[PDB]
Amino acid sequence: AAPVDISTLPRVKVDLVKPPFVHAHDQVAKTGPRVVEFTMTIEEKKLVIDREGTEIHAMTFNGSVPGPLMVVHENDYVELRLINPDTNTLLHNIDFHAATGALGGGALTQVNPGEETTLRFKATKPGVFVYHCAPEGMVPWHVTSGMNGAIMVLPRDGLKDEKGQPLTYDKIYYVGEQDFYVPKDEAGNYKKYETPGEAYEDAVKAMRTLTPTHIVFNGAVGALTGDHALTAAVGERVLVVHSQANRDTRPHLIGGHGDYVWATGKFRNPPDLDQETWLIPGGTAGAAFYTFRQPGVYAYVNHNLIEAFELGAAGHFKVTGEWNDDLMTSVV
Amino acid sequence: DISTLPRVKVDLVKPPFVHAHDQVAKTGPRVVEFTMTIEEKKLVIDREGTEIHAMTFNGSVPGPLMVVHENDYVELRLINPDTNTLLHNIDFHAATGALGGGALTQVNPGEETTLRFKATKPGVFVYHCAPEGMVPWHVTSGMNGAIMVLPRDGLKDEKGQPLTYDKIYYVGEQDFYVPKDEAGNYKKYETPGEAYEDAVKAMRTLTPTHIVFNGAVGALTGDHALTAAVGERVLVVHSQANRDTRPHLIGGHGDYVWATGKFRNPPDLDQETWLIPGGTAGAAFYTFRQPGVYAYVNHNLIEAFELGAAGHFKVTGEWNDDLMTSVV
Amino acid sequence: DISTLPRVKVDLVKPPFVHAHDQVAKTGPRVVEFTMTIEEKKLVIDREGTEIHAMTFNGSVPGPLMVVHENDYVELRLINPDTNTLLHNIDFHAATGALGGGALTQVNPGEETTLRFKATKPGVFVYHCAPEGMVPWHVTSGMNGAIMVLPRDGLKDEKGQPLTYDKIYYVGEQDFYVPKDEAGNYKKYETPGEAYEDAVKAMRTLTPTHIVFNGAVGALTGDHALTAAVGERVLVVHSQANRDTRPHLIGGHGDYVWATGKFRNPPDLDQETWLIPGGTAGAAFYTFRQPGVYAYVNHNLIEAFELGAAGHFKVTGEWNDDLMTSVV
Ligand SMILES: [Cu+2]
Ligand SMILES: [Cu+2]
Ligand SMILES: [Cu+2]
Ligand SMILES: [Cu+2]
Ligand SMILES: [Cu+2]
Ligand SMILES: [Cu+2]
């Protein structure tokens, strides 16, 4: 019942990085609980979301869609300084699904242009969680404008398999999947707007159709392909955190599997094994662990193939290494 | 021999509330008697006054939550007053045989029927009308509810230890497809039959015009918000008889969740959001640790804040600065 | 050395039936030989005579279910006759490498190819065509099926105890997007190629015009209804290569279900309904206890009864009044 003295906890500052990459961290905690300090600056900005040059007024956390992945360990405290520069035009806030109370922090972080605030919450549950803006009355508009990301709360002793044995990854990637509803004019062409506010009415209309115009990884069609394809080597253990703050998705690694998967992303639950495809409910973050055994190109996709190959929810993995004819081979 | 079992008559209560019951069974198997009267009635489903011809079990959308224990025999007397105009029946997902009972409970206006079935499997289950050839029309008109079949030794965590809730609420999520004219305005009809054709066309778009909790937009908000106190253990039963949903407690979690609602399976822990497939009932257990307002929503945020799938929790108690605070 | 492994030839069977096999392996690993011939053909998918240019594996929608055991080697000879017009290939979700085999099995009309891969993971998996740049078009044209890789010691329950089925059926669920003209009538094409543009357009609406089992509305009804007898243990393998579905046996349950179909995971028990994500194959085990007609459906009742995702079981045996009965 007595208060816990948090001033005694050591503090560590984190420098966030743009997705799909993840800031420096340790899987197995090397210290006891800490107050981990993060700072994110909200940025309203125009963003090209497809190959035809379609542009929208994106609402971002730190300039990217999705926002950066934050990483802490179970029972650490997350302290976020949220800044809303006066160059922005809208009210924003933040809802951490990893947090307990005040609408995930949303009721304590409402900031208008020119204001800032610092939120602190205890990361009491291990897993990957979604975080997103949630201004009362305009929630889906902000979220579907790209204002969402994720946070991973690692067990202090790292990841474990269904038998309680260590699962250690060599690389980690964060794939934020985004459903966009770009308004179209009477002619069927995407509309343009001077300011975010000007598009509200049309945006609401576009959203209520429940039919996305685009569904992409890392903010745009092909964002995770070509020179920006994810990479790995045969033998490498890779963890892919995947989030969707507003709509269901079903990740799948073409040519591979999800050896160990936490579809709804909570680590106190044993992972599902050998998944071909897994369902991540809208408003959830999930994580899949895989060890590559074949070199070459792999397609990482939302397995509703239309959403993947037509709407944009598809990325690539370029894997190096020696081919395994035992696992698979063309018979002459 | 069923005739040797105790018989008890239950008085059902309107959702989100639930009739009184014991979690850990107090007796052995019993024949639990329920009675529900079918009522076709106009219902306002949104703040704009939109009306539909609702098809209900006991006058509410969703129908009330029935509660029994594993291996009890459910005995339902279903009445279809001659004031209604359609044939109805009932399909219990908790039952075995005759299309969930649908093939044995067909009742035209002015008729009634009594069905009895053994609740052999523990968990929360959906029950809904299913008249041959017009199944989705009735279900999407609000004719569905749920039944909870508790394990005889109560709920258990992933370690087989007891989980006892202090409060329970039943949230029925309903997808509606209200027909519109060429102008785009919702159409009104004199009778349910008049709208069949338009209804079918509206349903086939697979795009709900409304998705609500307890029959209407904002039904579980304001004076009708759900309540709890810091420290209270709350079980929230959630059903969707026709379409997928993804429940989420904003500011909270599903400490223990049976997403597809069957208790022989250990619960999933610490869920932020969970998927309840259409045609399924799920259950989430949570112990409140912070006072204040919480939003309970389908986490497709468009479906929640635009279409109506959102409710509120008003929680009393003292704030916990350790769990969360605005830094000085 | 695979040259050391004995080989066995399998004769595939048209769905919903499955080719014979042993649940518990009677020998060590084997190289199992399969042969499938691709066939592009016009196909009637509804009771109104609507046709489409279907792209099939062995002439059926879905393609046949292949069955092997963990660690066997699957060797498939894929033939693309010069009577076809498009390039095709195959993607095995059960395989490891080269885009599931798609990058190694590309075959134009008049060509064939043989692919071999080790079945390292037990479970039911989807296989489908995946020609670069036209993946969804082929898959939604019916070019997909499934393969089951049984654990060498057969299926086991959540306790490690054996689960042996007396019957097994394979239900392939297909979402079709048939283009329509300005009048709203389904369009007709002389060749698959001529429809591409309209096909892409129709798919991007993400709204299927049809959702069927075994290639057509009512395909699994009447003389083609699935069958069983009271007391029989039945395994129903269900796949959806492109869109989510939620199987449900009306009047029954999924006693043991591997919703996402991977056997190294214990099954979920007593399911009323389960979610099989698009791009996944699932399996449900049930022991019938009541005779009569059952409806096996996708529980989004609109997709089932309006769009076509519904089939029937005809079960023989004695009625059990203890489980269910109409009172006087
Ligand atoms: Cu915002
Ligand atoms: Cu949220
Ligand atoms: Cu009815
Ligand atoms: Cu049902
Ligand atoms: Cu093909
Ligand atoms: Cu695939």
mmCIF file with all atom_site columns, all heavy atoms in Angstrom, chain A residues 213-225:
data_model
loop_
_atom_site.group_PDB
_atom_site.id
_atom_site.type_symbol
_atom_site.label_atom_id
_atom_site.label_alt_id
_atom_site.label_comp_id
_atom_site.label_asym_id
_atom_site.label_entity_id
_atom_site.label_seq_id
_atom_site.pdbx_PDB_ins_code
_atom_site.Cartn_x
_atom_site.Cartn_y
_atom_site.Cartn_z
_atom_site.occupancy
_atom_site.B_iso_or_equiv
_atom_site.pdbx_formal_charge
_atom_site.auth_seq_id
_atom_site.auth_comp_id
_atom_site.auth_asym_id
_atom_site.auth_atom_id
_atom_site.pdbx_PDB_model_num
ATOM 1  N N   . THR A 1 213 ? -7.562 1.617  -49.466 1.00 0.00 ? 213 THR A N   1
ATOM 2  C CA  . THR A 1 213 ? -7.128 1.897  -50.830 1.00 0.00 ? 213 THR A CA  1
ATOM 3  C C   . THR A 1 213 ? -5.702 1.361  -50.927 1.00 0.00 ? 213 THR A C   1
ATOM 4  O O   . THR A 1 213 ? -5.249 0.943  -51.996 1.00 0.00 ? 213 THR A O   1
ATOM 5  C CB  . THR A 1 213 ? -7.125 3.415  -51.139 1.00 0.00 ? 213 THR A CB  1
ATOM 6  O OG1 . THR A 1 213 ? -6.316 4.102  -50.177 1.00 0.00 ? 213 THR A OG1 1
ATOM 7  C CG2 . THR A 1 213 ? -8.545 3.973  -51.102 1.00 0.00 ? 213 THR A CG2 1
ATOM 8  N N   . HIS A 1 214 ? -5.013 1.374  -49.785 1.00 0.00 ? 214 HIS A N   1
ATOM 9  C CA  . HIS A 1 214 ? -3.640 0.884  -49.663 1.00 0.00 ? 214 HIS A CA  1
ATOM 10 C C   . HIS A 1 214 ? -3.469 0.155  -48.327 1.00 0.00 ? 214 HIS A C   1
ATOM 11 O O   . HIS A 1 214 ? -4.112 0.498  -47.335 1.00 0.00 ? 214 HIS A O   1
ATOM 12 C CB  . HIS A 1 214 ? -2.617 2.033  -49.667 1.00 0.00 ? 214 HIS A CB  1
ATOM 13 C CG  . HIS A 1 214 ? -2.680 2.930  -50.868 1.00 0.00 ? 214 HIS A CG  1
ATOM 14 N ND1 . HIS A 1 214 ? -3.726 3.798  -51.095 1.00 0.00 ? 214 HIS A ND1 1
ATOM 15 C CD2 . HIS A 1 214 ? -1.797 3.131  -51.874 1.00 0.00 ? 214 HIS A CD2 1
ATOM 16 C CE1 . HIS A 1 214 ? -3.483 4.499  -52.191 1.00 0.00 ? 214 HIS A CE1 1
ATOM 17 N NE2 . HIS A 1 214 ? -2.320 4.114  -52.682 1.00 0.00 ? 214 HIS A NE2 1
ATOM 18 N N   . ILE A 1 215 ? -2.594 -0.845 -48.317 1.00 0.00 ? 215 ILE A N   1
ATOM 19 C CA  . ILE A 1 215 ? -2.248 -1.606 -47.119 1.00 0.00 ? 215 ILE A CA  1
ATOM 20 C C   . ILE A 1 215 ? -0.760 -1.823 -47.340 1.00 0.00 ? 215 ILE A C   1
ATOM 21 O O   . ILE A 1 215 ? -0.362 -2.573 -48.230 1.00 0.00 ? 215 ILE A O   1
ATOM 22 C CB  . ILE A 1 215 ? -2.983 -2.956 -47.045 1.00 0.00 ? 215 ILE A CB  1
ATOM 23 C CG1 . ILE A 1 215 ? -4.498 -2.724 -47.055 1.00 0.00 ? 215 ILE A CG1 1
ATOM 24 C CG2 . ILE A 1 215 ? -2.591 -3.680 -45.757 1.00 0.00 ? 215 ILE A CG2 1
ATOM 25 C CD1 . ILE A 1 215 ? -5.319 -3.997 -47.143 1.00 0.00 ? 215 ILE A CD1 1
ATOM 26 N N   . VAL A 1 216 ? 0.068  -1.159 -46.540 1.00 0.00 ? 216 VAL A N   1
ATOM 27 C CA  . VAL A 1 216 ? 1.510  -1.227 -46.749 1.00 0.00 ? 216 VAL A CA  1
ATOM 28 C C   . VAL A 1 216 ? 2.387  -1.488 -45.534 1.00 0.00 ? 216 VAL A C   1
ATOM 29 O O   . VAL A 1 216 ? 1.950  -1.367 -44.389 1.00 0.00 ? 216 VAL A O   1
ATOM 30 C CB  . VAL A 1 216 ? 1.995  0.096  -47.384 1.00 0.00 ? 216 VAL A CB  1
ATOM 31 C CG1 . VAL A 1 216 ? 1.189  0.404  -48.641 1.00 0.00 ? 216 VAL A CG1 1
ATOM 32 C CG2 . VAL A 1 216 ? 1.844  1.236  -46.379 1.00 0.00 ? 216 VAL A CG2 1
ATOM 33 N N   . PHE A 1 217 ? 3.642  -1.843 -45.805 1.00 0.00 ? 217 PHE A N   1
ATOM 34 C CA  . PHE A 1 217 ? 4.625  -2.077 -44.756 1.00 0.00 ? 217 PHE A CA  1
ATOM 35 C C   . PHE A 1 217 ? 5.537  -0.856 -44.728 1.00 0.00 ? 217 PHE A C   1
ATOM 36 O O   . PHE A 1 217 ? 5.919  -0.331 -45.776 1.00 0.00 ? 217 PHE A O   1
ATOM 37 C CB  . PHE A 1 217 ? 5.494  -3.313 -45.041 1.00 0.00 ? 217 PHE A CB  1
ATOM 38 C CG  . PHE A 1 217 ? 4.751  -4.624 -45.011 1.00 0.00 ? 217 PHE A CG  1
ATOM 39 C CD1 . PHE A 1 217 ? 5.294  -5.747 -45.632 1.00 0.00 ? 217 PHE A CD1 1
ATOM 40 C CD2 . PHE A 1 217 ? 3.541  -4.755 -44.330 1.00 0.00 ? 217 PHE A CD2 1
ATOM 41 C CE1 . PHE A 1 217 ? 4.646  -6.983 -45.576 1.00 0.00 ? 217 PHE A CE1 1
ATOM 42 C CE2 . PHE A 1 217 ? 2.885  -5.988 -44.268 1.00 0.00 ? 217 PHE A CE2 1
ATOM 43 C CZ  . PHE A 1 217 ? 3.442  -7.104 -44.893 1.00 0.00 ? 217 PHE A CZ  1
ATOM 44 N N   . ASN A 1 218 ? 5.884  -0.404 -43.530 1.00 0.00 ? 218 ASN A N   1
ATOM 45 C CA  . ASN A 1 218 ? 6.773  0.738  -43.366 1.00 0.00 ? 218 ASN A CA  1
ATOM 46 C C   . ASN A 1 218 ? 6.344  1.984  -44.147 1.00 0.00 ? 218 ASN A C   1
ATOM 47 O O   . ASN A 1 218 ? 7.174  2.665  -44.756 1.00 0.00 ? 218 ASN A O   1
ATOM 48 C CB  . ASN A 1 218 ? 8.206  0.335  -43.748 1.00 0.00 ? 218 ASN A CB  1
ATOM 49 C CG  . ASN A 1 218 ? 9.262  0.994  -42.864 1.00 0.00 ? 218 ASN A CG  1
ATOM 50 O OD1 . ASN A 1 218 ? 9.116  1.050  -41.642 1.00 0.00 ? 218 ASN A OD1 1
ATOM 51 N ND2 . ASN A 1 218 ? 10.339 1.480  -43.480 1.00 0.00 ? 218 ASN A ND2 1
ATOM 52 N N   . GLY A 1 219 ? 5.043  2.262  -44.145 1.00 0.00 ? 219 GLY A N   1
ATOM 53 C CA  . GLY A 1 219 ? 4.521  3.459  -44.787 1.00 0.00 ? 219 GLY A CA  1
ATOM 54 C C   . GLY A 1 219 ? 4.276  3.584  -46.282 1.00 0.00 ? 219 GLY A C   1
ATOM 55 O O   . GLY A 1 219 ? 3.683  4.574  -46.714 1.00 0.00 ? 219 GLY A O   1
ATOM 56 N N   . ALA A 1 220 ? 4.707  2.620  -47.087 1.00 0.00 ? 220 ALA A N   1
ATOM 57 C CA  . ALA A 1 220 ? 4.481  2.742  -48.523 1.00 0.00 ? 220 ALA A CA  1
ATOM 58 C C   . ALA A 1 220 ? 4.674  1.445  -49.290 1.00 0.00 ? 220 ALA A C   1
ATOM 59 O O   . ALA A 1 220 ? 5.373  0.538  -48.840 1.00 0.00 ? 220 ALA A O   1
ATOM 60 C CB  . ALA A 1 220 ? 5.403  3.815  -49.099 1.00 0.00 ? 220 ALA A CB  1
ATOM 61 N N   . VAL A 1 221 ? 4.042  1.371  -50.456 1.00 0.00 ? 221 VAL A N   1
ATOM 62 C CA  . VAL A 1 221 ? 4.161  0.204  -51.314 1.00 0.00 ? 221 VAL A CA  1
ATOM 63 C C   . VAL A 1 221 ? 5.639  0.021  -51.657 1.00 0.00 ? 221 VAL A C   1
ATOM 64 O O   . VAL A 1 221 ? 6.323  0.984  -52.019 1.00 0.00 ? 221 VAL A O   1
ATOM 65 C CB  . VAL A 1 221 ? 3.374  0.394  -52.638 1.00 0.00 ? 221 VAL A CB  1
ATOM 66 C CG1 . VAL A 1 221 ? 3.579  -0.809 -53.548 1.00 0.00 ? 221 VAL A CG1 1
ATOM 67 C CG2 . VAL A 1 221 ? 1.896  0.602  -52.349 1.00 0.00 ? 221 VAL A CG2 1
ATOM 68 N N   . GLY A 1 222 ? 6.130  -1.206 -51.524 1.00 0.00 ? 222 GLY A N   1
ATOM 69 C CA  . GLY A 1 222 ? 7.516  -1.497 -51.848 1.00 0.00 ? 222 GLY A CA  1
ATOM 70 C C   . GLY A 1 222 ? 8.567  -0.932 -50.914 1.00 0.00 ? 222 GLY A C   1
ATOM 71 O O   . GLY A 1 222 ? 9.761  -1.031 -51.201 1.00 0.00 ? 222 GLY A O   1
ATOM 72 N N   . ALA A 1 223 ? 8.140  -0.353 -49.794 1.00 0.00 ? 223 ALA A N   1
ATOM 73 C CA  . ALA A 1 223 ? 9.075  0.227  -48.832 1.00 0.00 ? 223 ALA A CA  1
ATOM 74 C C   . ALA A 1 223 ? 10.125 -0.770 -48.354 1.00 0.00 ? 223 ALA A C   1
ATOM 75 O O   . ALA A 1 223 ? 11.267 -0.392 -48.090 1.00 0.00 ? 223 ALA A O   1
ATOM 76 C CB  . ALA A 1 223 ? 8.315  0.789  -47.632 1.00 0.00 ? 223 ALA A CB  1
ATOM 77 N N   . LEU A 1 224 ? 9.743  -2.038 -48.241 1.00 0.00 ? 224 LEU A N   1
ATOM 78 C CA  . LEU A 1 224 ? 10.672 -3.068 -47.785 1.00 0.00 ? 224 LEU A CA  1
ATOM 79 C C   . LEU A 1 224 ? 11.104 -4.019 -48.902 1.00 0.00 ? 224 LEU A C   1
ATOM 80 O O   . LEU A 1 224 ? 11.179 -5.236 -48.706 1.00 0.00 ? 224 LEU A O   1
ATOM 81 C CB  . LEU A 1 224 ? 10.049 -3.862 -46.632 1.00 0.00 ? 224 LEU A CB  1
ATOM 82 C CG  . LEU A 1 224 ? 9.685  -3.062 -45.375 1.00 0.00 ? 224 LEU A CG  1
ATOM 83 C CD1 . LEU A 1 224 ? 9.228  -4.019 -44.279 1.00 0.00 ? 224 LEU A CD1 1
ATOM 84 C CD2 . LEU A 1 224 ? 10.892 -2.255 -44.901 1.00 0.00 ? 224 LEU A CD2 1
ATOM 85 N N   . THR A 1 225 ? 11.392 -3.451 -50.068 1.00 0.00 ? 225 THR A N   1
ATOM 86 C CA  . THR A 1 225 ? 11.827 -4.228 -51.224 1.00 0.00 ? 225 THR A CA  1
ATOM 87 C C   . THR A 1 225 ? 13.048 -3.572 -51.864 1.00 0.00 ? 225 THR A C   1
ATOM 88 O O   . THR A 1 225 ? 13.437 -2.458 -51.499 1.00 0.00 ? 225 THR A O   1
ATOM 89 C CB  . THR A 1 225 ? 10.719 -4.326 -52.298 1.00 0.00 ? 225 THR A CB  1
ATOM 90 O OG1 . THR A 1 225 ? 10.439 -3.020 -52.818 1.00 0.00 ? 225 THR A OG1 1
ATOM 91 C CG2 . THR A 1 225 ? 9.448  -4.916 -51.707 1.00 0.00 ? 225 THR A CG2 1
#
